[model samples]
Target: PEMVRGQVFDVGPRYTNLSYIGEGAYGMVCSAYDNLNKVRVAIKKISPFEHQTYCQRTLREIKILLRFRHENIIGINDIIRAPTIEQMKDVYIVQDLMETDLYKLLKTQHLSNDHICYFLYQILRGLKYIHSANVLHRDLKPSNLLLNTTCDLKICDFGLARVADPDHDHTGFLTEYVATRWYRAPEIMLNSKGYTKSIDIWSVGCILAEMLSNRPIFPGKHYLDQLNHILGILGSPSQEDLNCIINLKARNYLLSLPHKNKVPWNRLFPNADSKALDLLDKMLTFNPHKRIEVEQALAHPYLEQYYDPSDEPIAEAPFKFDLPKEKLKELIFEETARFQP
Candidate 1:
């Protein structure tokens, strides 16, 4: 486990207001101002009560956070820990907060091909860095990704991450329930002999497709549900897919579901341009072993051409304005008009 143990910062007079930002299964997010700098930063504070030991995840998260410093990945100011009230002992984890998730942006409207391309590149770029450093972001989804100053991205949440060795493969009862269900790769879904970085790539495809279509590419409530959702859309896998399904371990395998229909990749994104659909088709192939590698995906035409790095001035006014719950439709239309090609 990555050692996140550090000097604890008691949540005391150091900062004034702590406004709640967001929350997830593992932790909660908030924003606070640094007393010295008087600057605002995002804080991802995780509960120590959830972990078996003290703040090992905080250490791993810092270790994971320190690995990449890129435009796409979220920035980390410092790792903070606060003391627990029950005893003099310390509670844990305060990380830099992020602006918003891709889910929020996509909820407004479907992204043009150009925007989708840019987002996909950043995803791959960040993943490439993680894979190169031997890190696997087991839980990759829209929510885990954050937008920063220039509206670029940052990949966060390493609680389920592990440093992997490219040469040796580890496959037993997986140490933890890792990864979001729908975004899970074929290898993980099928519980193949051993899983690898390719797992993240598979998820990237799911996330990328989800963003473009403004819908969950493979929406499922749980593991079995997610797998069935995938099968229903992707179609009953030919012989090869079934062969893969038969080979994995039963214990690690969570989804023991059946298929409903044969989904063609083309049909899934009817309006998607050819390049976008083509790339997604390769990444989401039922055979995880056969799924396209990250390096190759970096070279994909859709990513290379369509994805422009220029920060297309993200309009804040539209989103910043407020409206009642009923006016959301009108508000969304106003937001869409602000979007650029």
Candidate 2:
């Protein structure tokens, strides 16, 4: 029952314990009261290093939350400052408490066109800033996007994110095995040599389609199932479209599959407005080269109603944080001290 700075669960006295909420790969998540702020918050406690990814991801995530600022991007409330770096093994991150995420909300209730438009608008709005800074939010699934009961949405999670060149022809090396299969881009599934920001655009298309249908458009059991679902809807890729796949084995596999017709967007999402379908078509293009960039998607008539050049903020400068384990400890320690009251 010892819960103070020297103990494992030491958040701060100003924050009163509410209760444990849930747990997944992240760690024990709890809801707590902020005596200082007068609203509830989600305290995520993470153990960052039995595995190397945990530490690497922890630093990347902290750097991201520190660097990026936007309404639709999750903002930080606090980071429990441990007395020493050794005490940092267990870290606490305080953030605005969200009532639900798109995955659960979509399953539980219904949404109108207007509702989808607003939600989708905010996602693109946030993404513009993310990509503007040359950072790829590789994990863009519905669950990773959090929401409030009032319809506010915030993109969360940066474990698999990386910053790279924004060049469209793009020579940046992107990790292949990122993102949920259903939302993963074709190039990613086909084991392409590198990734462009288009990877996220493809996921956005999957999310928009999911919202329209009230189910995952491509709910693949695995990547094989994943690729087939994609092929079934978008049809088989042309040799030109298949050029991005550098893996001969992965390339041959797609070619060997039965030829599938390109299902029209209107048929895929029946009764949808032309603009909505137009945007969707561009986003889900089999070829990454043809996919709509975030900027172009924002201009599409479906979202033109929500577009505001001034409102959609970009990062003042690019973000980069390269640190090793010892250096990471100090960065977190310093950030904790800086964020402390």
Candidate 3:
């Protein structure tokens, strides 16, 4: 998390041969045996490119992977190395093993409501660590949440991630951010205006609903289509909510739409647990500002069993990405140095 799909040609000798786990269209992975770890692990093999998003993007990803120490956030256990950047044609990022992602489980297994609660709790807990550190995953979905049959789960993928808007740094400038359609927040799809931690919270809300219903809650065709799917069920956003829509045309389109009444959560998921529904409504609120905070969500009764105040961990240091203008080599070496044999 074969939670992945894709291919790899010249596989490494360090791990036993297994290929084509999954993709960003640049990297592929395999579940391989580890020596010191003594358990199977995922080896994400990526090709190096001369001038591509490949270099700096993975540099940032590897740096972030090393900075994080939480179990729920999918940390890199060991990174495979071969000489320096020049001689190497591919990169190796070894991480803990996760048999499948929630997407697969949702398709193959019947999930108990507690399945949603526990998984949802760990998501927020993992998110608690990331958000507390001022980073935004920017991409969160069932496929990104790796799961084990043990019912344990962890959040993965940081390729499209970025630092959250610094305090009062809201820039409404044209942003071209993109993510998986179903789990993307409306603010992101509407204006792509600089986003905050709230976008991730919105994704958790969508994921929670999916675990309950076993499908995407907002299965939209495109941006506007997603808006319609959202409005159709969660009811239309209040006119006041439009203030956050940085694009005037998007606001106008929403204004022109027929209103939709917010369906009662109980009515939609007839068998929904009251605690679960209450949390879902809060997270699914139209205004990101109104959506429940991760800390608050963990304390909510729906996930109280999974929340242990003593167990939650925040970043020891907030993520700081202001590396030198020439960051790729420094980052690669810095991360590689951390796991020297």
Candidate 4:
């Protein structure tokens, strides 16, 4: 995948019709063609107004991508800055476009045993690579796991990722805002200071459970509701949890549940292999100390059965653009150097 600038052809020639794909707070996504290669690509148009943060994010993404180039990781082609009629400039980045994310795919039936093995195994591989590089993907959720045109999964979005040491107690960990609340680790939800990669493992457990149950592990509409749902499932936290939570500001909103909420893994995923169910329980436990690590999760017999790198298929999903290769070169030329003022 080559990330290049958009080229302008003869004024009358029909360039690839750029269409709006999606938008986020920092940037918007558009579909365009690689006229140079006759292939379709997704271009994330970085908002010019968000130049500083966008550049930082781009740099960080490139760094992570370069170091961790696994099949489950999204590939970044290039950082492009295109020219405009006015003196001011515009930015357009090209890359492979995913048709949908895991969140949307999950709306259907629960994944088959094979599908779950493929999906979860890829996610763990990606995270393991990231962890080895000393990076943490603080935000782990179904929405962030992208499904390429080929149905293969790629972990995307690193806006909330951080660089940290896996050992020793530390600070700078963002509590109230880190991983998505639904999949948040017990340490973060409990406000433990300086959580680690275990946070991601917890989220993976949530995702695996969701795949098995065909429903969100925590489907609350608000902060209070979310807390209630979790408590209803896990019972009330201990006094130590209440008092030692970093700052403990949200404790006021918590109300105790009299009963112990326990759901056996087998009950939730009777069809799944016991090895998978066992691993899921360890990772999703309310106690952070008991949560499994990525290495441990990968070592589970369930994963061992399907851990063949040679068998994994690359994403073959296609997008809608059909521009010629000539047009893409023009886009690159037009984007690289300053055009007429």
Which candidate number has the best lDDT? Answer: 2
Model 4 C-alpha lDDT per residue in residues 14-87, reported as the tens digit of each score? 12656666664356666666676677666665443324454455445544554456667776654455344243
TM-score ranking of the models: 2, 3, 1, 4
Across residues 85-154, which tens digit of lDDT does each residue of candidate 1 receive? 2332332244455667887777886677777777787788777667766667778898888776556777
Query: Which of the two candidates, 1 or 3, achieves a greater lDDT against the reference?
Result: 3
Which parts of model 2 are misplaced by more than 4 Å? 1-8, 165-175, 243-247, 320-327
Q: Using TM-score, give the best candidate's number.
A: 2
Score every model by TM-score: 0.73, 0.89, 0.88, 0.73
Residue 106 error, candidate 4, Å? 1.6
Number of backbone-clashing residue pairs for each candidate, in the order shown: 12, 0, 3, 10
> What TM-score quantifies how close candidate 4 is to the native fold?
0.73
Model 1 residue 258 CA deviation in Å: 8.9
Native-vs-model 2 lDDT?
0.79
Cα shift from native, residue 163, model 2 (Å): 0.9
Report the Cα RMSD per candidate: 13.8, 3.5, 3.5, 9.0
- Local accuracy by lDDT, each model: 0.61, 0.79, 0.76, 0.63
In candidate 1, which residue ranges exceed 4 Å CA deviation?
Answer: 1-14, 24-26, 53-56, 82-97, 165-177, 241-262, 306-341
Worst 10 residues of 4 by lDDT: 6-15
